[PDB]
Amino acid sequence: GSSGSSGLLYDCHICERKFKNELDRDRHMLVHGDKW
Ligand SMILES: [Zn+2]
């Protein structure tokens, strides 16, 4: 059993893509929020 020294911390609830910061994920949610 093995695991990496680093990883992605934040996740999209629309398309399951992941990010290093809350900011990087939060501005990605705008690509889904455009479908108003
Ligand atoms: Zn997404």
Query: What is the whole-number distance in angstroms between the Cα of residue 22 and the centre of ligand 1?
Result: 13
13 is in an annotated binding site: no
Which residue has 């629309």 as its token pair?
A: 14
Query: What is the whole-number distance in angstroms between the Cα of residue 1 and the centre of ligand 1?
Result: 30
CA distance to 5, 25, 26, 35, per residue, from 8 (Å): 11, 10, 14, 26
28 is in an annotated binding site: yes
Question: Which residues neighbour 22 within 8 Å (Cβ) at sequence distance 6 or greater?
Answer: 9, 10
Total H helices, total E strands in the chain: 2, 2
32 is in an annotated binding site: yes
- Way the structure was solved: NMR
Tokens read off for 21: 């910061």
CB 12 within 8 A of CB 28: yes
Residue 36 to residue 33: CA distance in whole angstroms: 6
